[PDB]
Design a binder for this molecule. Sequence first.
Ligand SMILES: *CCC1=C(Cc2[nH]c(Cc3[nH]c(CC4=NC(=O)C(C=C)=C4C)c(C)c3CCC(=O)O)c(CCC(=O)O)c2C)NC(=O)[C@H]1C
Ligand SMILES: *CCC1=C(Cc2[nH]c(Cc3[nH]c(CC4=NC(=O)C(C=C)=C4C)c(C)c3CCC(=O)O)c(CCC(=O)O)c2C)NC(=O)[C@H]1C
Lengths: 482, 482
Amino acid sequence: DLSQCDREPIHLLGGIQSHGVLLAFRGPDRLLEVVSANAQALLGRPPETLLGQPVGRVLPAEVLAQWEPLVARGSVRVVLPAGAYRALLHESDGLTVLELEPAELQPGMEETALEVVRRLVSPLAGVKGTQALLQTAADTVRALTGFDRVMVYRFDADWHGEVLAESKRGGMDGFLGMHFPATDIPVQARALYTRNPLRLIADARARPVPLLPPVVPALGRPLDLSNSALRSVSPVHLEYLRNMGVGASFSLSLLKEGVLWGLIACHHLEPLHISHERRRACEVLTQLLALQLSAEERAAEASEDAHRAALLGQLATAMGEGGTLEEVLEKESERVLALTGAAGVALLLGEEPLLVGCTPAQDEVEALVAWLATQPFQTSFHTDRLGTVYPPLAARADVAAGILAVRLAPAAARFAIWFRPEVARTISWAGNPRKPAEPEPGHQRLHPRGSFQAWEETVRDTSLPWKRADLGAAEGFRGALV
Amino acid sequence: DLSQCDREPIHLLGGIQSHGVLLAFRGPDRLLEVVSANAQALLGRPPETLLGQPVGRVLPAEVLAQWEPLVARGSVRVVLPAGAYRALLHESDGLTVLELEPAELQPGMEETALEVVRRLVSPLAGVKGTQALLQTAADTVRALTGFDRVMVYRFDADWHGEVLAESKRGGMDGFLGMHFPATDIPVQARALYTRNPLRLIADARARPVPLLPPVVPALGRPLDLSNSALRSVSPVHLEYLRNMGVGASFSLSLLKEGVLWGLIACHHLEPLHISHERRRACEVLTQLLALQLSAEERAAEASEDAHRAALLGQLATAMGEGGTLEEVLEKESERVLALTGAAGVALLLGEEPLLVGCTPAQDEVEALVAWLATQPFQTSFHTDRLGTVYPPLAARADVAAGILAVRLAPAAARFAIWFRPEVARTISWAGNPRKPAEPEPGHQRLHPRGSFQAWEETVRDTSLPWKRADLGAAEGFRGALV
Ligand SMILES: *CCC1=C(Cc2[nH]c(Cc3[nH]c(CC4=NC(=O)C(C=C)=C4C)c(C)c3CCC(=O)O)c(CCC(=O)O)c2C)NC(=O)[C@H]1C
Ligand SMILES: *CCC1=C(Cc2[nH]c(Cc3[nH]c(CC4=NC(=O)C(C=C)=C4C)c(C)c3CCC(=O)O)c(CCC(=O)O)c2C)NC(=O)[C@H]1C
């Protein structure tokens, strides 16, 4: 259900967080289009005052002369009196928006950065697990920027998600694992993330400063301030940081193959600044988890479906050692129950069901196969909510929860299905998971939570997942029987 | 192993490189043991002289401070007068050694080092080949190292291999797709390569130079300068250079998962040098493609094994429809002869076999199992040399070149086998491999082979090797034939 958590158009508000410089260019005489109320404490003149006029009469040697390589390169180094700010510019509406903001100072970066990166890619990164991949990312970002707590909050199925890391200064709180809403990083904000990796809400205690003059003439709405290394970000997300204990919340975003995954998310007690170049090399490490993820949750399969096949290669040479349908589906479906580690399986190869492991009684099954000739799939329907499809076989939530359809033939109920059950689970939310975002009488003006204190919920009457190798252990066993 | 190339004790050989100054202080109260030849140049005295004399009673004030921060840190920033170098050390045989050796002249070395990490990484890399993947990185090695000819090359099957990547400058003789030996980086090299990537012969033409006193007081032979940086080399490797465009080598490990997937040398037309940090930068990137093409085989497998589920599926729902095997197979033949990377096929199910496609004569299909049942296997026998281990069929470079077996019922002579042609496939060999290195009258000191021109090896035999997602389509079939 779309809501104004999603609705509300967070690219175009009134640009930028108060340490910036947007001076923007309709046409070939540059000309100053959308300026910045905060433009008098760099430059020397007020903005209004050169809003109508060229970059001949605006920019100083420093930034101006390297307006050439701006185009050429993407980044340049204006080192004008105030110290050393950045620049960064792309095309907008009819706009060559020069951005521009503070610079890094230390040679650290390469040396710091590197010693850091070779942590997150050693001789063999994954000797004791994937947690140890996840975490180092966390460790290194919090130790590469210089922070307190960070995390690995990944989305799942619902676009829900949970934090899967922690590195800290013994004396904050956290959010260690705890599942907490899908009504946070919503579709308009977290789809602008496939596009615009990195954020910097930082001294997100302070106020947002406007542009000039609100509507960027021609267009109608504000600018398009989405691709801009500065976005002042919404209230709805900042009223909420203020209840959380955040001057700055960084968030370094993620992806492997043209899908999201989760974020990085660095909380800090007071507010901090990270440079174009080094929240760009933040990006180079969040990028570097998304590989070694891809790599060997992939390769895990290969390895881990040899040790599956051997269990097929066993129940195959059974086949080889004397015609014995029933009796050799009996013994080597200890090894079938364990193909997909489960508690049973009933088979309908014509007669009744020689049904073996730890499942329901014939009566129930027979009522199940009929009902299952009613459902629409090419080979194998599976479910992990046995009530949510066929609630006759609810109360069997203790040995049933999912089944593994394989139609052994066309216009027939010839089959085999098995019985995977319910499991504890304490996915723990950051307050009652029902109410995530709660407002005042009318329902147009809504605010944050103000909570996060481990209100538990019990994912229950559920089951496990169905790893690529389950689905695939079946289509090989189709051919076995035929 | 094999011939005066054989034995040579290539590490413990004394003799170092002339821009660095190796020397260790054995003993507890840390006392200068053996000093290195052209040891002064930086050290101000005659080498021999100060052969007793504690840590720093000898080597300056400057380094005496630094003495402390390298015990702890591995690496320090020494700076005497003569531009002045920095030692990276270890503890390579009871004594614990200097490697006092140049520096980074300009803080770009790192600047560059990081951004060429980006070229070889951005998610959307390897999206126009893996020839290109490999190459893309290889292009950003050479970008740093300065060098004038980079390789990146793989050892196939044997411990031979072929230059399968280039990237030279102008008028540079090139091995683009060219090919050469095994007796180059021989047994001795690697065992030494797996533990420390990197080797540098930089004035590869300037002559080594002793280090007093060729054999260690309390041990026997020359040092054992195994792990080091201004070592030298078997007096032969830099020897099979003086008869090439020899600049100075620079080679790396790509130890892929466990084993040595090859390496990547680069030489100039004359002298160069690179630094401790720029070496490590070298190192870091060969870890890279290595990790990269691990993640690519380990992937494109997963693609194949899923790709021929959806084949098999097709197959089994021919298999479970009509009258009998011979009938269903007639068409589905072509579909199974698309599985063992499909070439041809047998099918000895008792009766006179079957030929479904391209095959030889029913006699030769029986005279195979006559041989096969007499010799070993639990199942199956991909030999692509099928005309040598079994030459009754030693002329079938049309119809059969290897085969694929499968025990259909085990302890019983029913198989189901695959014919798989010879394949003409040009090979441009470098000089004559019937000349690894021509020796002198005696056969006891070898100089090398001093020519390397295009050498044709159009082979007729072998057969496009069966892989995992090849071979792998068989375990299932064992199960199918029943
Ligand atoms: C009615 C809409 C609502 C918004 C708007 C909104 N939500 C987000 C996303 C967001 N939420 C969190 C929470 C959080 N605390 C942590 O420690 C971590 C990670 C471990 C998370 C995810 C985060 C971090 C984010 C976005 C990442 C970030 O905040 O840096 C956003 C994104 C902000 C934007 O404008 O881009 C918006 C706009 N918030 C609500 O509660 C509801 C009302
Ligand atoms: C009779 C014994 C022989 C030796 C002894 C020997 N050779 C080497 C070095 C070596 N050869 C190659 C191959 C190679 N890599 C490339 O990129 C190219 C083309 C430009 C070629 C031909 C390599 C890579 C190496 C070592 C890499 C390097 O140069 O650093 C060594 C290694 C000595 C050491 O480990 O320090 C030994 C001991 N070589 C012969 O050909 C025969 C005569």
